[PDB]
Amino acid sequence: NLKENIVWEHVFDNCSQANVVFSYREFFNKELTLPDGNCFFRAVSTFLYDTQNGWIEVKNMCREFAETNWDELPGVHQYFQDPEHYARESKREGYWGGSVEAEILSKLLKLTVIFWKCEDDVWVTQGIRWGDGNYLTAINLLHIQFDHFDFLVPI
């Protein structure tokens, strides 16, 4: 029961986490992303544009929100000194998206972002969430081994 039986526990700022056990195919259809280091941005691109091909625009909008709204990003502050530092690192070859950008996008887009942990391509066992919504009002990502992210579309 994804709408009522989840015990989300505060982590930090707008981030919470939970043990939540379900076969993801009962609630979602999975859309694969290219297995490169841009997979997080590819998954969000699929949500925004119906194609993973716009992943650079997602990286761009994260950098821009860091510049215009730096004060609202305490999670980002744990890892980056200022917006210019974030822009420098996120443009680098080999940068991998994740929790930093989940915070940024939840606040830029004003919706919830959820990472659903799944290690056997069937069963989710944990969630981590930025924002206060449930999965129907969220960007849902399947978070599998080696920090690969695929996109999940609610049924």
Tab-separated table of C-alpha atoms in Angstrom:
chain	number	residue	atom	x	y	z
A	1	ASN	CA	0.000	0.000	0.000
A	2	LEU	CA	2.109	2.864	-1.388
A	3	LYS	CA	-0.354	5.587	-0.407
A	4	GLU	CA	-1.029	4.707	3.250
A	5	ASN	CA	1.360	2.196	4.904
A	6	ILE	CA	4.745	3.920	4.455
A	7	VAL	CA	6.559	5.155	7.561
A	8	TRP	CA	8.698	7.978	6.183
A	9	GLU	CA	11.414	8.998	8.649
A	10	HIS	CA	13.049	12.432	8.560
A	11	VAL	CA	16.609	12.501	7.205
A	12	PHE	CA	17.553	16.139	6.484
A	13	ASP	CA	15.611	19.238	5.335
A	14	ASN	CA	12.989	18.005	2.844
A	15	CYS	CA	14.468	14.471	2.625
A	16	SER	CA	12.916	11.423	4.310
A	17	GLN	CA	13.435	7.657	3.985
A	18	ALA	CA	11.563	4.410	4.572
A	19	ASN	CA	11.655	0.636	4.362
A	20	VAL	CA	8.921	-0.180	1.849
A	21	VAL	CA	8.567	-3.613	0.243
A	22	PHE	CA	6.671	-4.240	-2.984
A	23	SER	CA	6.935	-5.654	-6.486
A	24	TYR	CA	7.353	-2.487	-8.534
A	25	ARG	CA	5.439	-3.904	-11.524
A	26	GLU	CA	2.259	-3.809	-9.434
A	27	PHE	CA	2.453	0.017	-9.362
A	28	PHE	CA	4.739	1.124	-12.206
A	29	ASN	CA	5.981	0.485	-15.706
A	30	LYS	CA	9.767	0.820	-16.041
A	31	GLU	CA	11.431	2.846	-18.804
A	32	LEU	CA	15.142	2.147	-19.160
A	33	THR	CA	17.829	4.820	-19.408
A	34	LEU	CA	21.167	4.477	-21.156
A	35	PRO	CA	23.621	2.879	-18.656
A	36	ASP	CA	26.138	5.701	-18.560
A	37	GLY	CA	26.972	8.183	-15.838
A	38	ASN	CA	24.152	10.505	-16.911
A	39	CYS	CA	21.387	8.026	-16.063
A	40	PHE	CA	19.876	10.171	-13.263
A	41	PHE	CA	19.450	13.108	-15.650
A	42	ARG	CA	18.247	10.750	-18.391
A	43	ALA	CA	15.476	9.477	-16.117
A	44	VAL	CA	14.351	12.998	-15.211
A	45	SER	CA	14.548	13.951	-18.896
A	46	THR	CA	12.156	11.087	-19.663
A	47	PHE	CA	9.706	12.545	-17.129
A	48	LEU	CA	9.909	16.118	-18.454
A	49	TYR	CA	10.299	15.526	-22.209
A	50	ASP	CA	9.152	11.918	-22.911
A	51	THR	CA	12.711	11.204	-24.102
A	52	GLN	CA	16.005	10.686	-22.317
A	53	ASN	CA	17.697	12.798	-25.028
A	54	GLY	CA	17.245	16.014	-23.049
A	55	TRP	CA	19.469	15.054	-20.105
A	56	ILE	CA	21.789	18.051	-20.711
A	57	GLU	CA	18.867	20.438	-20.271
A	58	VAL	CA	18.201	18.834	-16.888
A	59	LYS	CA	21.838	19.376	-15.892
A	60	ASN	CA	21.500	22.978	-17.103
A	61	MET	CA	18.354	23.692	-15.095
A	62	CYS	CA	19.965	22.307	-11.928
A	63	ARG	CA	22.959	24.625	-12.322
A	64	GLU	CA	20.671	27.591	-12.968
A	65	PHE	CA	18.525	26.954	-9.885
A	66	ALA	CA	21.678	26.591	-7.793
A	67	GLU	CA	22.661	30.092	-8.943
A	68	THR	CA	19.281	31.796	-8.529
A	69	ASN	CA	18.089	29.987	-5.390
A	70	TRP	CA	21.287	28.943	-3.587
A	71	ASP	CA	19.862	29.908	-0.187
A	72	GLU	CA	17.155	27.216	-0.401
A	73	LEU	CA	19.594	24.303	-0.922
A	74	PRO	CA	21.068	23.157	2.432
A	75	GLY	CA	21.684	19.646	1.131
A	76	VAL	CA	23.750	20.993	-1.768
A	77	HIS	CA	25.669	23.164	0.717
A	78	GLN	CA	27.049	20.039	2.396
A	79	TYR	CA	29.115	19.279	-0.715
A	80	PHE	CA	29.606	22.526	-2.651
A	81	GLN	CA	30.997	25.883	-1.562
A	82	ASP	CA	28.955	28.098	-3.900
A	83	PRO	CA	26.957	27.922	-7.160
A	84	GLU	CA	30.126	28.351	-9.227
A	85	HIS	CA	31.714	25.343	-7.512
A	86	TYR	CA	28.620	23.230	-8.220
A	87	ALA	CA	28.550	24.346	-11.868
A	88	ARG	CA	32.247	23.515	-12.250
A	89	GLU	CA	31.894	19.985	-10.881
A	90	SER	CA	28.587	19.109	-12.541
A	91	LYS	CA	29.992	19.998	-15.978
A	92	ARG	CA	32.898	17.589	-15.526
A	93	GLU	CA	33.221	14.401	-17.505
A	94	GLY	CA	32.354	11.643	-15.082
A	95	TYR	CA	29.910	13.541	-12.863
A	96	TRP	CA	27.057	11.306	-11.624
A	97	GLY	CA	23.687	12.755	-10.661
A	98	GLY	CA	21.821	11.781	-7.534
A	99	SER	CA	20.680	13.099	-4.147
A	100	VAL	CA	22.148	16.561	-4.774
A	101	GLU	CA	20.005	17.016	-7.882
A	102	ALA	CA	16.969	15.304	-6.343
A	103	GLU	CA	16.918	18.118	-3.771
A	104	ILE	CA	17.418	20.775	-6.463
A	105	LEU	CA	14.731	19.408	-8.765
A	106	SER	CA	12.157	18.894	-5.992
A	107	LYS	CA	12.487	22.600	-5.158
A	108	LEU	CA	12.721	23.911	-8.733
A	109	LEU	CA	9.821	21.851	-10.088
A	110	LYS	CA	7.778	21.965	-6.842
A	111	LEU	CA	7.131	18.240	-6.799
A	112	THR	CA	8.358	15.159	-5.008
A	113	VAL	CA	11.288	12.995	-6.154
A	114	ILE	CA	11.545	9.381	-4.942
A	115	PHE	CA	14.369	6.836	-5.315
A	116	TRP	CA	13.031	3.277	-5.003
A	117	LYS	CA	15.806	0.799	-4.142
A	118	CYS	CA	15.683	-2.434	-6.149
A	119	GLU	CA	18.454	-5.021	-6.490
A	120	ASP	CA	16.758	-7.986	-8.228
A	121	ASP	CA	14.727	-6.129	-10.930
A	122	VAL	CA	11.477	-7.155	-9.155
A	123	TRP	CA	11.288	-6.112	-5.498
A	124	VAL	CA	11.709	-2.621	-4.103
A	125	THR	CA	12.811	-2.676	-0.453
A	126	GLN	CA	13.465	0.998	0.441
A	127	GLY	CA	12.596	4.527	-0.581
A	128	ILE	CA	14.233	7.901	-0.141
A	129	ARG	CA	12.139	10.946	-0.895
A	130	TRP	CA	12.562	14.699	-1.424
A	131	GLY	CA	9.270	16.499	-0.796
A	132	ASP	CA	6.023	15.584	0.948
A	133	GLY	CA	4.022	13.879	-1.811
A	134	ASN	CA	3.212	10.281	-2.538
A	135	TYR	CA	4.270	8.305	-5.580
A	136	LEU	CA	1.360	9.517	-7.706
A	137	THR	CA	2.599	13.138	-7.443
A	138	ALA	CA	6.288	12.289	-7.775
A	139	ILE	CA	9.088	11.738	-10.200
A	140	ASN	CA	9.696	8.053	-9.412
A	141	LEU	CA	13.123	6.553	-10.127
A	142	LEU	CA	14.212	2.925	-9.868
A	143	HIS	CA	17.544	3.065	-8.028
A	144	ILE	CA	19.499	-0.117	-8.734
A	145	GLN	CA	23.077	-1.282	-8.160
A	146	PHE	CA	26.090	0.902	-9.071
A	147	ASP	CA	23.989	4.079	-8.866
A	148	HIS	CA	22.073	3.392	-12.046
A	149	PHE	CA	18.632	5.030	-12.267
A	150	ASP	CA	15.720	4.030	-14.479
A	151	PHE	CA	12.399	5.846	-14.798
A	152	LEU	CA	9.145	4.535	-13.319
A	153	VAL	CA	5.722	5.525	-14.698
A	154	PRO	CA	2.802	5.002	-12.276
A	155	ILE	CA	0.086	2.697	-13.561
